Design a protein around this ligand. Structure first.
Ligand SMILES: Nc1nc2c(ncn2[C@@H]2O[C@H](COP(=O)(O)OP(=O)(O)OP(O)(O)=S)[C@@H](O)[C@H]2O)c(=O)[nH]1
Ligand SMILES: Nc1nc2c(ncn2[C@@H]2O[C@H](COP(=O)(O)OP(=O)(O)OP(O)(O)=S)[C@@H](O)[C@H]2O)c(=O)[nH]1
Ligand SMILES: [Mg+2]
Ligand SMILES: [Mg+2]
Ligand SMILES: [Zn+2]
Ligand SMILES: [Zn+2]
Lengths: 209, 211
């Protein structure tokens, strides 16, 4: 079984991160939802207080790895080929290329996709799902599985909602109905509205481990 | 894994069945929310006077898009795709059993929203259309060259929103042409309808060129 084998490696990964005092976050989303830009902003705001590392996973991982690196983060690129999602196996090897005693926060950018990364625990402490208004306001209700795995649901690009005809209150209500336990934040990474709430989720999650 | 060899056999059988009944089929792929359904809706509205049109709508919860296509006057077979990140020829083959192919001229299949998995899975269609949009970012085409190479038409949709996301549409258009020199590349807005003429052109040309 592939799912049993993943959970095994996820717990192993999580055990290793805890040993070295690292708090890890899994950033999932659709394609272009805003994962990298969110991580970029988080690095800029948190790097004074925390030592931050990133794992950037995509077909061509260099695009986002380089985007993260310039913000002052240690970054491990992971070329994911035709895989729909990152897994605890690939993440485990990425952790071997990190000095976890010189790192406090780990931001993992998962492959852009709303089906597959649901079911694949990477060994992180929290999971963030970033969707955007430009995907249409049915995007949350159309993908309940992944939404239920989220600790934070980010509804990004609120500044473009009217232009696509997206109802952001519908999206907010959909997220809360499908996952009552998750935090839900309305965000624009352009205007920065709602960014303080995402930052707060990160900071609290770290202190709660 | 022998998955792709078995799929190809079924895809060829699907194409033969479609050709037998004079149906031209189109596989609509893309990212999440790129505009596949809205494009299909617009195509139905503008071609239904000339062609009898059927759709296959595949997604986790297929009803959302099936219901949209239904109100535009197409016969729709919904496919609830579960955790699968692509449709395949097998499921499409069985969907074809629910259609009267002697009363259909065009088949529009909306694949699941994913730029990775559908690349390797031929559905048994005549043409493949990849819809991406400016709001996903202007690196989207060069970040996923695999699926782009499988496209006969590449649609760069939501051009009306490019400035608001900082996307360079000229860059994206060049990315698409360079990665797939054989594909048609269309800049589109389904809001203003600019570029729609070129999509219709592709559909009609494809129909005329079959076999
Ligand atoms: N207008 C506006 N644009 C945004 C917002 N958030 C992200 N974007 C834009 O969306 C595009 C995609 O953002 P990006 O950060 O690259 O997404 P991503 O999820 O990481 O994309 P991926 O390829 O790895 S799957 C970029 O052009 C970025 O500027 C927002 O809140 N408002
Ligand atoms: N402004 C603008 N909005 C568009 C354009 N094309 C589509 N949209 C909007 O984008 C959103 C997504 O469109 P939709 O047709 O549902 O995408 P889809 O690709 O079929 O989405 P999916 O859930 O099946 S994966 C909708 O809100 C729609 O109104 C466009 O060209 N310009
Ligand atoms: Mg990214
Ligand atoms: Mg759709
Ligand atoms: Zn290994
Ligand atoms: Zn069968």
């Amino acid at each position: 079984d592939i799912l049993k084998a993943n959970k095994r490696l996820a717990d192993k990964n999580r055990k290793l991160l805890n040993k070295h005092g690292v708090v890890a976050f899994d950033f999932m989303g659709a394609i272009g939802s805003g994962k990298t830009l969110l991580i970029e902003k988080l690095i800029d705001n948190l790097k004074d207080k925390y030592k931050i590392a990133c794992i950037a996973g995509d077909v061509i991982a260099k695009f986002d790895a380089e985007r993260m690196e310039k913000h002052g983060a240690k970054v491990v690129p992971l070329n994911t080929g035709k895989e729909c999602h990152l897994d605890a196996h690939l993440v485990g090897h990425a952790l071997e290329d990190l000095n976890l005693d010189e790192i406090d926060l780990l931001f993992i950018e998962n492959v852009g996709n709303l089906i597959c990364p649901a079911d694949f625990d990477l060994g992180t402490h929290k999971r963030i799902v970033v969707i955007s208004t430009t995907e249409g306001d049915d995007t949350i209700e159309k993908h309940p599985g992944i939404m239920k795995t989220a600790d934070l649901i980010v509804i990004n690009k609120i500044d473009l909602a009217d232009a696509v005809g997206a109802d952001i209150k519908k999206m907010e209500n959909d997220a809360k109905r499908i996952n009552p336990d998750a935090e839900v934040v309305l965000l624009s990474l352009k205007t920065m509205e709602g960014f303080d709430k995402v930052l707060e989720f990160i900071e609290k999650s770290v202190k709660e481990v």
